[PDB]
Write a protein that binds this DNA or RNA. Structure first.
Ligand SMILES: *[C@@H]1O[C@H](CO)[C@@H](O[C@@H]2O[C@H](CO)[C@@H](O[C@@H]3O[C@H](CO)[C@@H](O)[C@H](O)[C@@H]3O)[C@H](O)[C@H]2NC(C)=O)[C@H](O)[C@H]1NC(C)=O
Ligand SMILES: *[C@@H]1O[C@H](CO)[C@@H](O[C@@H]2O[C@H](CO)[C@@H](O[C@@H]3O[C@H](CO)[C@@H](O)[C@H](O)[C@@H]3O)[C@H](O)[C@H]2NC(C)=O)[C@H](O)[C@H]1NC(C)=O
Ligand SMILES: *[C@@H]1O[C@H](CO)[C@@H](O[C@@H]2O[C@H](CO)[C@@H](O[C@@H]3O[C@H](CO)[C@@H](O)[C@H](O)[C@@H]3O)[C@H](O)[C@H]2NC(C)=O)[C@H](O)[C@H]1NC(C)=O
Ligand SMILES: *[C@@H]1O[C@H](CO)[C@@H](O[C@@H]2O[C@H](CO)[C@@H](O)[C@H](O)[C@H]2NC(C)=O)[C@H](O)[C@H]1NC(C)=O
Length: 170
RNA sequence: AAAAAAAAAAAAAAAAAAAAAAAAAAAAAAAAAAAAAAAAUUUUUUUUUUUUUUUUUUUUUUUUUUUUUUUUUUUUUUUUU
């Protein structure tokens, strides 16, 4: 679709919505603030698609009202910012994150502290840098099953990465 | 009472010379010191600009294999009004 951007009460009224897809829908959406998905406060979403939406910036607490959201997609996007953990604020029971196909995703030791209940995490060709810092960004995470960091050309790695991750399988 | 000549001693003061020294100031010569400015041999460290080798990410180009839709060039055996 070709909607430029959403409004304050665009999705207001959906009290039972759980499957929402917005792939290749937004063209004027360059920066994601915490006033875009305010309409989905009462919507118990479970899946979310946001591929090909030309998303380049997300603000702190953007998905704060997405407490019941479990699956969200952010692949095939132009995200260029610093991950500090507050981008996933408000995610009570999150399942997995589609965060592949990007151009720059800087990671820090607190980039994933807020959400410790992840199951799958793929970072395919997102050009990740500066990961070998101690402690590892994945210290709070324990329930991951699939971890993909392929096609990223990691500069360095140390022992602190991927230690104690008992639940990993892939 | 006073005045003078040969001849021998002693006391105050002034101007001198020589010798034995001792202090203050001034000149060098040696043995050291503390430094603010200096140069010169050796081994290392930071930063800027660039050289060589190896491993990989993005994009572009060539060749080969395979798959899906359209323009279709044809057809053999039949059907057909
Ligand atoms: C959002 O919508 C898009 C478009 O429908 C969904 O894309 C689909 O994603 C799946 C899984 O990533 C793709 O399946 C995989 O395809 C690859 C080839 O690209 C294949 O090698 C794998 O084995 C697997 O079959 C699927 O092809 C793809 N479809 C399209 C049309 O792109 C996406 O999954 C949606 N996201 C969410 C969270 O709903
Ligand atoms: C959505 O994102 C915006 C942008 O970051 C957030 O605005 C920021 O909110 C914080 C917290 O209120 C502000 O910091 C503090 O605000 C209080 C307000 O009383 C003030 O007294 C403090 O001195 C301090 O400034 C911050 O200034 C503000 N920045 C901007 C540019 O608006 C907003 O809070 C976020 N909303 C949600 C629901 O996450
Ligand atoms: C979104 O949340 C992150 C936190 O996850 C915010 O980053 C935080 O920003 C503050 C303010 O700059 C930082 O405090 C100061 O940081 C400097 C270094 O930049 C440090 O020298 C100071 O002593 C002080 O701690 C804080 O460290 C930083 N935290 C992280 C984890 O990066 C970010 O500002 C928020 N953005 C918005 C728009 O609300
Ligand atoms: C990590 O995964 C485990 C296993 O799925 C979670 O343990 C389950 O948690 C749910 C909800 O709290 C309970 O209903 C189940 O009975 C638990 N199962 C077991 C075997 O313990 C655990 O909660 C997850 N951790 C986090 C932080 O989400």
């Amino acid at each position: 679709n070709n909607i430029p951007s959403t409004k304050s009460n665009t999705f207001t009224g959906l009290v039972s919505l759980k499957y929402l897809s917005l792939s290749k829908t937004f063209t004027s959406l360059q920066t994601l603030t915490n006033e875009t998905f305010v309409s989905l406060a009462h919507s118990p979403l479970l899946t979310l698609n946001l591929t090909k939406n030309h998303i380049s910036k997300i603000a702190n607490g953007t998905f704060s009202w997405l407490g019941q959201l479990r699956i969200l997609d952010l692949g095939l996007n132009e995200i260029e910012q610093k991950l500090s953990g507050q981008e996933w604020r408000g995610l009570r029971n999150i399942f997995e994150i589609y965060l592949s196909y990007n151009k720059y995703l800087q990671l820090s030791t607190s980039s994933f502290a807020l959400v410790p209940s992840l199951q799958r995490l793929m970072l395919r060709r997102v050009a990740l840098k500066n990961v070998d810092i101690s402690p590892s960004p994945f210290r709070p995470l324990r329930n991951l099953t699939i971890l993909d960091l392929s096609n990223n050309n990691i500069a360095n790695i140390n022992e602190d990465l991927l230690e104690g991750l008992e639940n990993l399988e892939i």
